[PDB]
Amino acid sequence: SKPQPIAAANWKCNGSQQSLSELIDLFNSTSINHDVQCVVASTFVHLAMTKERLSHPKFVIAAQNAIAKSGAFTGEVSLPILKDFGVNWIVLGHSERRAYYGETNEIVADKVAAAVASGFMVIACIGETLQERESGRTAVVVLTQIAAIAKKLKKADWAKVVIAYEPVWAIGTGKVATPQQAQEAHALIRSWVSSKIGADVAGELRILYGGSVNGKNARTLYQQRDVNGFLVGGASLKPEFVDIIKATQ
């Protein structure tokens, strides 16, 4: 059995009014006949356009990032401002933020906890780099990451967490991940949850894959045992995203 799958569009730092309104239009015309939760994470700027125009009832909108408290933090957006704006989903600890914007395990854990304390649904990203994969440190790394997040949550909190596995080693490295490798990483995450938190938490937990998914490979990836959906990059800006959602049947 699988828990309810998730198809999440990570638009990243992209979009214009025209192009995004067109995409939201396709989305609104789409028949989604099964139980999938579709999630659109736009830039802070486009949240209002998005919120207003996406009318399809299988789609929720999400923010790509946030900080815990409001205040003197010029240029940043806090969880409280997001909640007031009526945004209940968030992406946290994405690899790009970990690589470029100084987010350590500890910072991610803290944000996830704040988000969780305020009532958000979080997609928490984890993943190891090339050097880590190569020296055979995959399990150590990913589990070290998960445990940092886990260290801040209560068992009940897991109901609001969704984990996304990013194969950093294969993103921009000229390396390629196979479905089997994706499965081997997700099975590692899920066993840890099982032993450490509980087979109850472990069986309900969604684990999304966040490597390269396109409409061609999506189905083979979803077919794997421990894959519950996708955190999609590039293809989420294309009509092809529709094929990715259909792949979670």
Question: Which of 94, 96, 103, 128 is labelled catalytic?
Answer: 94
CB of 198 to a copy of itself, least distance (A): 31
CB of 60 to a copy of itself, least distance (A): 17
Nearer to a copy of itself, 82 or 146 (CB): 82
Cα 87 from chain centroid (whole Å): 15
Residues near a copy of itself (CB under 8 A) are: 10, 12-17, 43-49, 64-65, 67, 70-78, 80-82, 84-85, 91, 94-97, 100-102, 233
Query: Is 228 within any annotated ligand binding site?
Result: no
For residues 89 and 198, give the distance between their C-alpha atoms in angstroms, rounded to a whole number: 24
Tell me the torsion sign for CA atoms 87, 33, 211, 222: positive
Give the torsion through C-alpha atoms of 41, 44, 50, 51, to 10 deg. Answer: 100
Amino acid identity of residue 97, one-letter, is R
Nearer to a copy of itself, 2 or 73 (CB): 73
Nearer to a copy of itself, 98 or 206 (CB): 98
CB of 46 to a copy of itself, least distance (A): 8
Question: Which of 46, 128, 166, 186 is labelled catalytic?
Answer: 166
Task: Examine the residue annotation and report whether 166 is marked as an active-site residue of this protein.
Answer: yes
CB of 233 to a copy of itself, least distance (A): 7
β-bridge partners, 230: 7, 209
Question: Are 227 and 181 spatial neighbours (Cβ–Cβ below 8 Å)?
Answer: no
Nearer to a copy of itself, 102 or 136 (CB): 102
Sorted by sequence, the CB contacts under 8 Å of residue 75 that are 6+ apart come out as none
Query: Is 12 within any annotated ligand binding site?
Result: yes
For residues 241 and 102, give the distance between their C-alpha atoms in angstroms, rounded to a whole number: 30
Cα 211 from chain centroid (whole Å): 11
Task: Examine the residue annotation and report whether 94 is marked as an active-site residue of this protein.
Answer: yes
| Catalytic sites, residue numbers | 94, 166
Binding residue positions for substrate: 10, 12
